[PDB]
Amino acid sequence: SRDLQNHLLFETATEVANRVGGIYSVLKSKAPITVAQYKDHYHLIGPLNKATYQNEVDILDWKKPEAFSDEMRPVQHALQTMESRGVHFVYGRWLIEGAPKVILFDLDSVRGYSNEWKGDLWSLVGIPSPENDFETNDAILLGYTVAWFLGEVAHLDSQHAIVAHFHQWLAGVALPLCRKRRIDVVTIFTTHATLLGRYLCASGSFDFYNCLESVDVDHEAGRFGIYHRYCIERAAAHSADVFTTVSQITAFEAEHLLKRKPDGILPNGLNVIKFQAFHEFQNLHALKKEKINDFVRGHFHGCFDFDLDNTLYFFIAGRYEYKNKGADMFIEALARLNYRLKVSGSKKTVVAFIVMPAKNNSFTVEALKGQAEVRALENTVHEVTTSIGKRIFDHAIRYPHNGLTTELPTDLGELLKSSDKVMLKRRILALRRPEGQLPPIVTHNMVDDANDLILNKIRQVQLFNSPSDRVKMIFHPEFLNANNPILGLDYDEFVRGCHLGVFPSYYEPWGYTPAECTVMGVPSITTNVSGFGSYMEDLIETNQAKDYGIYIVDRRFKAPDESVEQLVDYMEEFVKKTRRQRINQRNRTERLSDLLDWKRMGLEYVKARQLALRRGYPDQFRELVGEELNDSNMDALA
Amino acid sequence: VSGSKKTVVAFIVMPAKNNSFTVEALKGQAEVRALENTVHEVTTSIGKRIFDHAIRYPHNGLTTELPTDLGELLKSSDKVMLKRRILALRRPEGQLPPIVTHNMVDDANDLILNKIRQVQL
Amino acid sequence: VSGSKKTVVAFIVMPAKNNSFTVEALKGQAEVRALENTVHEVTTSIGKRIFDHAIRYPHNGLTTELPTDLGELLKSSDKVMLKRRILALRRPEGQLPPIVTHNMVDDANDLILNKIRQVQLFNSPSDRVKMIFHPEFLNANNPILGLDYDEFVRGCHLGVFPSYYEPWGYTPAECTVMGVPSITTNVSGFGSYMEDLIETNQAKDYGIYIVDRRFKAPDESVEQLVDYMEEFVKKTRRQRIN
Ligand SMILES: O=c1ccn([C@@H]2O[C@H](COP(=O)(O)OP(=O)(O)O)[C@@H](O)[C@H]2O)c(=O)[nH]1
Ligand SMILES: O=P(O)(O)OC[C@H]1O[C@H](O)[C@H](O)[C@@H](O)[C@@H]1O
Ligand SMILES: OC[C@H]1O[C@H](O)[C@H](O)[C@@H](O)[C@@H]1O
């Protein structure tokens, strides 16, 4: 007789205590909505990071009677039973919006059981475990600790149904354990990628999306030295009451590589902070864009022959994954767009930015002299307009006396003196660049310039930023930061200033980059093999979606060359827009950002847990609803 | 030896073969420039708040003519960006302000740098 | 009565015979302007001091990134001049912000001024509605309020034009075009025209408040008018923006 309505939720992940990847940001942004639903029935569980946990967690005395409510007692008693057997942990408040409750286990305090637990797991599930793989060691240590902790809560809490939700294989070991030991909790597993997915796509030669149905998983996992890891992912997918992925595209991948068709998808939400005035973001775009204009003026000093009032900023940003993030298509397409723009005789310019970290030796001398010379021009101009102001003023205050017959000066000579001209001329000379020197394709000195994938592609297609190129190309091999001496914007600030994000992903389980972009109200190009793109694709009819600034390139059903051409089409369609059209588009794409808020995507998590309880206690569940609903899906339940 | 609190900055301006300014030289000037602008933004805010106090006193609970407490004027948001600017100015442990502003074509053979190294300034 | 914390400053812009702005009005602006410049001086000094601290950290005993004490930044010299400017703004005990910006020709028999006196809105602290009569049309050269009429309207929140005779009324129509909500009556050309295009409930949301001066006794009308104003004051910024 367990309460399905008043239930507990434990959410388990490697990244709870600490930031490794994006998952840390998912559980962080997801917290406010979760705590709103559960309050003190919710606990996140992860391994303790001894180095950092004190910056992020608010340590709490869990022994205190007041630390838990009457109905939460079992959790306290469960921790005491863990403490009883020498298992050290930290219970506290994760210092983030929502302030969820945390249980972090000290894996050193349980490392003793390593030999036995490894032996056990091998016997139960068939999972081998090489000693030099520190991560699966920790994955295992965690798994037995969590199933242990869960088993004990199940013992002492007769009131609530318990939901246990695990993220990624590194947090999946408890799953086969809960199944086999038949612990009275319902379980959910979310995968945010698949191990074989990443690896089969690493080299860039393999035709992933048309061939994965015919891969021998065991053979491949052995080929990559990944067999043990893969076993953990598979056992977690098979053991869980509910199996989920972050996206339809990974769900496809998952069915074939983990041999189980997901029960649904849990797409990543963001915690969107609205402005008091809807148009505020529109003002921010203009401020931020002026900062970029500034950067551009300096970068093109001595070669500035285009109109910024008619210049669009494209960007790609993210980790340096040349094939997987589609940097190759981005550059390829830009080169073809350059051609189309010249043939049509348009006066517009695209300045294309690539923001991807590469080994480098900091900014070039050129980058910094240029900024400084432009600054020096600004300051001189300012001195001069003070002078001009003094002369305009005298004239205006003097009229019509002492010969002044016109109210205003009519001769520039009256306002602009020769000493003024000399210093302006000197500043202009400072900006001149030597004959034949084009603005660089890069802001940094690179460690391995000759072998760099991105730079080689730019050089191969020959986008050298010459006067007649309508598409300019700037590689910035480092993450943006308002401390950057040449382009002093934080990443988010930069995105707001740009016009179009271009993210032609080939392997991308989610798509934080275009989502985040969408949230800043900036249109973007994605692909249908990106999680975000595939999500969007299901939500809006593909022609409609261009109007909300989502452009989706088909990389799944189209030859690579046909994909590049579609990308050029989109970019070209965008450049043809007028300012009015751009503005109104950004408005539409700003309204779309609602659909990426947790207030909406959190409903999916609700669907998943509702499915888990439905599956685990079907008798009691029907008894709540009124009749028997379908349980072969998350969707077929609601 | 005499415990003087004075400092002498000695400049040598003599043309020698070089490859123009160092990255270090240009980066330092840029970072200092960035601190200046941030300080200017903040003092605008500070002005807004001094001015409000001045025009409001003695109403709405104001008991002193001027602010007495910094927190009235300097907000979390302001403190964050100045801290960040200060971090940009920080140099790696044990790194010293250079004895030269340019990259030299032949730094080891240059007579001036040889002397400065020899006397260990 | 409702204990609201909002404040309405109401302006009346209507030409009446006058001898130009009072001395008080001009001194007022000049005094405020002089405070502004002294505040700008002080913050430049503050700037030098914040900057020095920031560039020196953590040398010479500067153990924290920022100054923590106001006295590292605000010097006594600064304090003296700020106080002198604060004293210049001090008005003698009991004296209240004026209800008028000009010296009137016939102050005693002016209709606007007499009504304000009769209803006793004298701009006292406890009054939540403040009143400023400005008996001249607006012009950007006006030394006191350097705005052109169109600009002033843009700056405002609500135009209120409860005409009883108004063949049209550009006054409320101009508000509309400039995105400022307005109150007119159903006996104005403009009001009945809008009445015809939008159903009265919807009309309030599109910033068109229409007071019924045709089928209600004048006192009922005045009340409807107060309802509108109160309902408006109840709005949040977000609501006003929308
Ligand atoms: O200059 C930058 C560029 C990117 N990012 C962030 O780094 C992440 C990079 O995403 P990644 O490529 O690792 O994953 P994906 O974008 O494919 O989801 C994004 O969420 C950005 O917010 C950043 O912080 N600074
Ligand atoms: O950068 P664009 O697409 O040309 O848009 C530029 C526009 O951005 C925002 O809407 C600003 O508020 C406008 O004042 C500006 O005209
Ligand atoms: O038509 C312009 C104007 O004509 C008259 O001056 C009316 O009094 C006024 O209400 C109308 O707007």
CSV table of N, CA and C in Angstrom, one decimal, chain A residues 531-574:
chain,number,residue,atom,x,y,z
A,531,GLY,N,20.0,16.9,-32.0
A,531,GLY,CA,18.8,16.7,-31.1
A,531,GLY,C,17.9,17.9,-31.2
A,532,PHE,N,18.4,19.1,-31.0
A,532,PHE,CA,17.6,20.3,-31.1
A,532,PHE,C,16.9,20.5,-32.4
A,533,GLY,N,17.6,20.3,-33.5
A,533,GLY,CA,17.0,20.3,-34.9
A,533,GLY,C,15.8,19.3,-35.0
A,534,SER,N,16.1,18.1,-34.7
A,534,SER,CA,15.1,17.0,-34.7
A,534,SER,C,13.9,17.3,-33.7
A,535,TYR,N,14.2,17.9,-32.6
A,535,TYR,CA,13.1,18.3,-31.7
A,535,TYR,C,12.2,19.4,-32.4
A,536,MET,N,12.8,20.6,-32.7
A,536,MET,CA,12.2,21.6,-33.5
A,536,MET,C,11.4,21.1,-34.7
A,537,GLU,N,12.1,20.2,-35.5
A,537,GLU,CA,11.4,19.6,-36.6
A,537,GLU,C,10.1,19.0,-36.3
A,538,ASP,N,10.0,18.3,-35.2
A,538,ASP,CA,8.7,17.7,-34.8
A,538,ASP,C,7.7,18.7,-34.3
A,539,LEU,N,8.1,19.8,-33.8
A,539,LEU,CA,7.3,20.9,-33.2
A,539,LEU,C,6.6,21.8,-34.3
A,540,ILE,N,7.4,22.2,-35.3
A,540,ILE,CA,6.9,23.2,-36.2
A,540,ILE,C,7.1,22.6,-37.6
A,541,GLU,N,6.1,22.8,-38.5
A,541,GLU,CA,6.2,22.4,-39.9
A,541,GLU,C,7.3,23.2,-40.6
A,542,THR,N,8.2,22.4,-41.3
A,542,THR,CA,9.6,23.0,-41.6
A,542,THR,C,9.5,24.3,-42.4
A,543,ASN,N,8.5,24.6,-43.2
A,543,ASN,CA,8.4,25.9,-43.9
A,543,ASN,C,8.1,27.0,-42.9
A,544,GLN,N,7.0,26.9,-42.1
A,544,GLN,CA,6.7,27.7,-40.9
A,544,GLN,C,7.9,28.1,-40.1
A,545,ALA,N,8.8,27.1,-39.8
A,545,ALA,CA,9.9,27.3,-38.9
A,545,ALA,C,11.0,28.3,-39.3
A,546,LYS,N,11.2,28.5,-40.6
A,546,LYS,CA,12.1,29.5,-41.1
A,546,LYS,C,11.6,30.9,-40.6
A,547,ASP,N,10.3,31.0,-40.5
A,547,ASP,CA,9.8,32.3,-40.0
A,547,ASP,C,10.1,32.6,-38.5
A,548,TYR,N,10.3,31.5,-37.7
A,548,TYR,CA,10.6,31.7,-36.3
A,548,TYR,C,12.1,31.7,-36.2
A,549,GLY,N,12.9,31.9,-37.2
A,549,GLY,CA,14.3,31.8,-37.3
A,549,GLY,C,15.0,30.4,-37.0
A,550,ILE,N,14.2,29.4,-37.2
A,550,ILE,CA,14.9,28.0,-37.1
A,550,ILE,C,15.0,27.5,-38.5
A,551,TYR,N,16.3,27.4,-39.0
A,551,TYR,CA,16.5,26.8,-40.3
A,551,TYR,C,17.1,25.4,-40.0
A,552,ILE,N,16.5,24.4,-40.7
A,552,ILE,CA,16.9,23.0,-40.5
A,552,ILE,C,17.4,22.4,-41.8
A,553,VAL,N,18.7,22.1,-41.7
A,553,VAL,CA,19.3,21.4,-42.9
A,553,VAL,C,19.2,19.9,-42.8
A,554,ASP,N,18.8,19.3,-43.9
A,554,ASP,CA,18.7,17.8,-44.0
A,554,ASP,C,20.0,17.2,-44.2
A,555,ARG,N,20.6,16.6,-43.2
A,555,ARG,CA,21.9,15.8,-43.3
A,555,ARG,C,21.6,14.3,-43.3
A,556,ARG,N,20.3,13.9,-43.2
A,556,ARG,CA,20.0,12.5,-43.0
A,556,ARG,C,19.5,11.8,-44.2
A,557,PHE,N,18.9,12.5,-45.2
A,557,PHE,CA,18.3,11.9,-46.3
A,557,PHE,C,18.8,12.5,-47.6
A,558,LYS,N,19.9,13.2,-47.5
A,558,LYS,CA,20.4,14.0,-48.6
A,558,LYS,C,21.9,13.8,-48.7
A,559,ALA,N,22.4,13.7,-50.0
A,559,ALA,CA,23.9,13.7,-50.2
A,559,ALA,C,24.6,14.9,-49.6
A,560,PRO,N,25.9,14.6,-49.2
A,560,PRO,CA,26.6,15.7,-48.5
A,560,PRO,C,26.6,17.0,-49.3
A,561,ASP,N,26.8,16.9,-50.6
A,561,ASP,CA,26.8,18.1,-51.5
A,561,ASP,C,25.4,18.7,-51.5
A,562,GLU,N,24.3,17.9,-51.6
A,562,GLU,CA,23.0,18.5,-51.5
A,562,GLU,C,22.7,19.2,-50.1
A,563,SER,N,23.4,18.8,-49.1
A,563,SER,CA,23.3,19.4,-47.8
A,563,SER,C,23.9,20.8,-47.7
A,564,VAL,N,25.1,20.9,-48.3
A,564,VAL,CA,25.9,22.1,-48.4
A,564,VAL,C,25.1,23.1,-49.2
A,565,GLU,N,24.5,22.7,-50.3
A,565,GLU,CA,23.7,23.6,-51.1
A,565,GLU,C,22.5,24.2,-50.4
A,566,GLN,N,21.8,23.3,-49.6
A,566,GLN,CA,20.7,23.7,-48.8
A,566,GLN,C,21.1,24.8,-47.8
A,567,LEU,N,22.3,24.6,-47.2
A,567,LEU,CA,22.9,25.5,-46.2
A,567,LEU,C,23.1,26.8,-46.9
A,568,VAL,N,23.6,26.8,-48.1
A,568,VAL,CA,23.9,28.0,-48.8
A,568,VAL,C,22.6,28.8,-49.1
A,569,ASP,N,21.6,28.0,-49.6
A,569,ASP,CA,20.2,28.5,-49.8
A,569,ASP,C,19.7,29.3,-48.6
A,570,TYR,N,19.7,28.7,-47.4
A,570,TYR,CA,19.3,29.3,-46.2
A,570,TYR,C,20.1,30.6,-45.9
A,571,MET,N,21.4,30.5,-45.8
A,571,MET,CA,22.2,31.7,-45.6
A,571,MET,C,21.9,32.8,-46.6
A,572,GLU,N,21.7,32.4,-47.9
A,572,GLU,CA,21.4,33.4,-48.9
A,572,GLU,C,20.0,34.0,-48.6
A,573,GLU,N,19.0,33.2,-48.4
A,573,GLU,CA,17.7,33.7,-48.0
A,573,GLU,C,17.7,34.7,-46.8
A,574,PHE,N,18.6,34.4,-45.8
A,574,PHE,CA,18.7,35.3,-44.7
A,574,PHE,C,19.3,36.7,-45.1
